[PDB]
From a paper:
[name] ribosomes (mitoribosomes) synthesize proteins encoded within the [name] genome that are assembled into oxidative phosphorylation complexes.
Dissociation of NOA1 allows for docking of h44 and its stabilization through binding of a helical segment of mS38 as well as repositioning of h27 to form the base of the platform. The discovery of ERAL1 within states A and B enables a direct comparison with bacterial systems in which available structural and biochemical data indicate that the binding modes between [name] ERAL1 and bacterial Era are similar. As a C-terminal tethering peptide of bS21m is already observed in state B, it is likely that this segment of bS21m is responsible for the initial docking and eventual incorporation of the bS21m–S11m–h23 module in state C upon dissociation of ERAL1. In states A–D, the presence of both of these factors prevents compaction of the 3′ major rRNA domain, splaying rRNA elements and protein modules apart to allow for significant intermodule flexibility.
Residue numbers in the entry:
A (entry chain 0): 165 to 216
B (entry chain U): 27 to 103
C (entry chain 0): 6 to 55
D (entry chain D): 190 to 229, 239 to 430
E (entry chain O): 48 to 237
F (entry chain M): 10 to 124
G (entry chain N): 4 to 112
H (entry chain R): 66 to 356
Amino acid sequence: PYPPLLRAMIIAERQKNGDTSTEEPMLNVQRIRMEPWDYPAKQEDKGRAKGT
Amino acid sequence: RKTRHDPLAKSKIERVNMPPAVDPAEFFVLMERYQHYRQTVRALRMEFVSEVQRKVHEARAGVLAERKALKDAAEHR
Amino acid sequence: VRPRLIAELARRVRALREQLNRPRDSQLYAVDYETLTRPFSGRRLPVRAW
Amino acid sequence: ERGWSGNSWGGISLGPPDPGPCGETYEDFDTRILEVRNVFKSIRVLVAVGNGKGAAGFSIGKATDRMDAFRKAKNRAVHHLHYIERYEDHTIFHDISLRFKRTHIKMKKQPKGYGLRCHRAIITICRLIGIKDMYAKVSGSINMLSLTQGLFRGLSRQETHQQLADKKGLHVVEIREECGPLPIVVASPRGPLRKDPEPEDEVPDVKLDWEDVKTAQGMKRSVWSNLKRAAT
Amino acid sequence: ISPYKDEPWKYLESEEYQERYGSRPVWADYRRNHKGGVPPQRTRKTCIRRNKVVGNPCPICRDHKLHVDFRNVKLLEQFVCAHTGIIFYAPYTGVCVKQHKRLTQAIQKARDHGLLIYHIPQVEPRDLDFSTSHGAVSATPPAPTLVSGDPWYPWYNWKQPPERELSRLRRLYQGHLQEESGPPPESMPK
Amino acid sequence: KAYRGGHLTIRLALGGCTNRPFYRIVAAHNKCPRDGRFVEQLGSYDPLPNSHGEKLVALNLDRIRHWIGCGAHLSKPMEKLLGLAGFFPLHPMMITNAERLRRKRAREVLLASQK
Amino acid sequence: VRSSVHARWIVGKVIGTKMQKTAKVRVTRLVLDPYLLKYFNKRKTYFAHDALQQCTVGDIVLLRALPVPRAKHVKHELAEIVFKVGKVIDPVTGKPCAGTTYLESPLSS
Amino acid sequence: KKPTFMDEEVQSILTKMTGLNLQKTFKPAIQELKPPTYKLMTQAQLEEATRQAVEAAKVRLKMPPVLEERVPINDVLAEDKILEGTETTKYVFTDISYSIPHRERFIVVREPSGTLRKASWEERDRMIQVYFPKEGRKILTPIIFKEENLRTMYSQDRHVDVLNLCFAQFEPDSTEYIKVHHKTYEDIDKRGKYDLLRSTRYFGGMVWYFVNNKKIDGLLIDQIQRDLIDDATNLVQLYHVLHPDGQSAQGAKDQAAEGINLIKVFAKTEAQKGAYIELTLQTYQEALSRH
Amino acid sequence: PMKGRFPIRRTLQYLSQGNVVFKDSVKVMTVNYNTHGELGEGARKFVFFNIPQIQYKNPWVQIMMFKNMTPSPFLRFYLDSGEQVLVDVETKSNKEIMEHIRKILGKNEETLREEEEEKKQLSHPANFGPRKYCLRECICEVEGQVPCPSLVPLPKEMRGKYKA
RNA sequence: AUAGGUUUGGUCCUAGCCUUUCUAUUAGCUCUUAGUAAGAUUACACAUGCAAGCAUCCCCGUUCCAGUGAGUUCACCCUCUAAAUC
Ligand code: FES
Ligand SMILES: [K+]
Ligand SMILES: [K+]
Ligand SMILES: [Mg+2]
Ligand SMILES: [Mg+2]
Ligand SMILES: [Mg+2]
Ligand SMILES: [Mg+2]
Ligand SMILES: [Mg+2]
Ligand SMILES: [Zn+2]
């Protein structure tokens, strides 16, 4: 579901533009894959300690 | 604040930051809550990014913008 | 603008000396197991790793 | 009551003028001292009189004694009265710019409640005449006699709205911001009315004062302008 | 001690006031004492200092029967321009700062009580359209969770972790554990 | 001004007086001072209850959505405010702190009963 | 977007032709005096690429910005000659003129 | 259907009944003054200026719409019980996006119980004043609208000032607006002060209220006494169209009453003081004959 | 007094009376006019009275004047596209020339009103900040809210000195 | 500036200087309370203590914030286009 206020605003805009459909607004989350925090990162992009 | 060239204070050269103790049940529930909340917030952020890009595209080459461009070009003619 | 050439000279010399005096992994990631500190920098490892 | 200063004769009232040999009384007239000077000894006094209803005058008096000079000046002033036209009996009909000898005077008509923001002598003379709202600036040599003469001259040579209507044969219509777009006709020609409109001068060739334009544009910065002062 | 303290406006229609001031304002005859031709841009703070009047008290302070009250409308009118409705600044009438502040407050109170006439302009409406059909002011369709009594998201509620995960955490954090917490109270304890 | 790296973030800049805080919700570079230069003011937050017993929060939702869609980050207090407004989900820590406070009040009630 | 030169179109008078394929042009703009509130002419010199060497000192020319500068000071090119010096063609009628008098009468055509 | 207040026919009747007195419409305002300007004008130019002033007055006298009292807002967006007891004061969230009509603007309240609900009309008005302040409006209700201060204002015959303050402070569909306007109209009716509102934008609303509450007797009497017979006949006609199934409309249809006969029809059928209406009308007819 | 004939021309109010705001296409305006001849009189007036106003309203447009180079006065406008617009101005008064150029190359009132409405959005009334940019400095200026401690002391319970 | 004082035996003109107004610092004398704001003269020299960590090791941060006004048209707009966030 959308957050309450954002859902209310989406529905209000829909009714303002004449749409009267009753389907609930929904946030698609299938494309947001939650990667485990301990997944290996990109070592090529990591830095190195400077000599001193 | 100190710069990297400033020396470390002598009163904390023997300081160990001991990690805090964990409550396993609360820890696990909080981890799951952060996962779900971040998924939802990322979905919302993607939606807002799409709105911003769509508004920019409409401003440049939308039907209203192109109509107004043809209109004032004609009027000039 | 009066040229600032010493700055360029120093930048180039520093880059060369950093690329020629690179610390090696055996130096950077060595550890003293008694005190659990890096001898290269003297910084102690986090407790949760000890 | 004191005059313009504690030790100054200027601004002090001398009371009503004495009943004249013609037999007229002047109980409605007030007299004010404008200047007292030692003539090398005699005394020369410049005084002004006025009934507060447009009739006002001024005179010089020379005598060995101060009181004799006052009496002479007052009695001669009452017999040399100007009548000063007042718009709505509180202000002048239009802005008046004049130069008498080396003394320059700019006078500006003002709305009700503006008060007398004028040279102190001008404030005194205006109170004698009956003008209640006006702005005045005196430039050049501040000579008291020249100031008085120029003030009376300019105020006596002001054109009333009726005079302008008769001259131009047209309605004089007043526009007030507090009254909106309502046209108020203040004067109409006594004779016939011209059917051709005044030329709509796209840019009039008027002589502007840099002082007024500078104030209007906000480039005036004087620390002495628009200071709070007692009611006048 | 004034007999007009309870009804100050009485003093303005008493013969004593008429003899003292006539039809002119109570501040008409007052004059400040100062050096130079340009007066200081503020009046004195107060003419009465520790129950002692200064040598030249201001028009309000020089008369103890003049009471600055929001009901004394006629006295307040003397300190407002009749042609612009603007309260005179203190140097105009010579009133001290204390009495000027009191007069300003009394005038504002009189205007707020409808006792002193002031110009009330005619304004345009706030909105162009007066419709109330938008969802911001109308009823929004309830969400399924609101009808069902469930939380908006399932993770708003506490779910007991499996014992295997609790044991995994107990191994991960050996020697640095707190007492395990159970499900929280369903409502806020009173 | 060029900062090394950095990003835009929507955060709370503190104004007001001693013992009277007030907040402006602004989008600013993270490296900038707290009350310094900002890109846009996106709202305000008065944390002191007014005469009606209300904490007033103004949110420019259109501009907040714009700046989130342009890559701006959010500070934790701002995320919590947006969760309270219903614009975002309730932050996990509001839920966790509520549960902790419930448990603490339960312990206090149990102490009272035991006494 | 089409050019990095600030002045896209400018009109000026050719004041020099001593450089090869380059004309030195004087451009006047009207600048307000903040105090007097009167407009005064302010002059600026521009170098314009003139490939064909058709510019003569004193003629009024139009300069178009180059997409990028071709030299340190050459940022413009000669778009056209508005008024050739002493060979002015009246634009309203199209006929040659010498000052305020027609060399060829408009009625002749 | 029954005509609305904004119907063209009703609006024309009320506009002509209001009148247009330029002197009252553009009465000199007590404000900061500037030196007046002067123009030399011919007769034609003066007439053109007067016509432009008439058009400006017509714009100034535009009648505010008459609205029905707004229904209270009672809508819950969410019930987050987990938040219950975690806060002591409510949060008010106002969406301050610039380009939104104020009646389409989302304003919500998070209560200490954890309920996210929509703000009430009073809360909406206070918040909109807080963030979009309107000149003349106050966040806190002025005390002039209390009953005692309203009595004082009425005693000073400052009804138009009261209505201007009401229009500045309250929304047209708000309860306070309606109550104050109705109280002012009742005072005008009780004390016969109708002329106070003539040539103003509130006369139409007052007339509409009187017509819908069936108390046009005093206004009709005042119009007759002021020799505004066309206004009186139009008032009876508006009464008939607003009440077409009443005794007055039926009688006027029956005997084919027109003009003053409509007033006689109303006085005989549906007037609370028809006798005195008849007396005033008969006196007016005698005066007209004598003149 | 102010020097020169028609000193009103050198006042900001007159300079802001100008009603010609060129479209963005116009880059250069050349004004060819003649010093003598009745038929060019209006053009001369156009140079005397209206060029200052046009320049004031269009500071980035290059205006240049030419004298006695052609038998007839005329205006020429160079556009960014490369087009040239010629306007003959014999027998035309200065007011007529102004109206003509306003019609053919001037922004209409609708576009100007749109631009002012866009300018309005930049100054949001709800923002709090310095007087140079915002209506109010702080929320404490809003009635019903807690006022400044500078003007009204806070109760001891809300001050840290009495909480620590 | 609403101006005023002052050149002469005297009048007029010109012209400088000063007075009256509003701030800031310092000095003399004097000084009850509460709230708030602001607070080295010095780019002279500095005793002493603090001002940068975090984190299952890698990294990241310490290039920020805070300070000063010595030097002084690198600050603004347009074109182009890196690094950075998404
Ligand atoms: S300025 Fe807001 S509390 Fe003082
Ligand atoms: K780290
Ligand atoms: K410096
Ligand atoms: Mg003395
Ligand atoms: Mg001098
Ligand atoms: Mg001291
Ligand atoms: Mg600091
Ligand atoms: Mg990049
Ligand atoms: Zn006093």
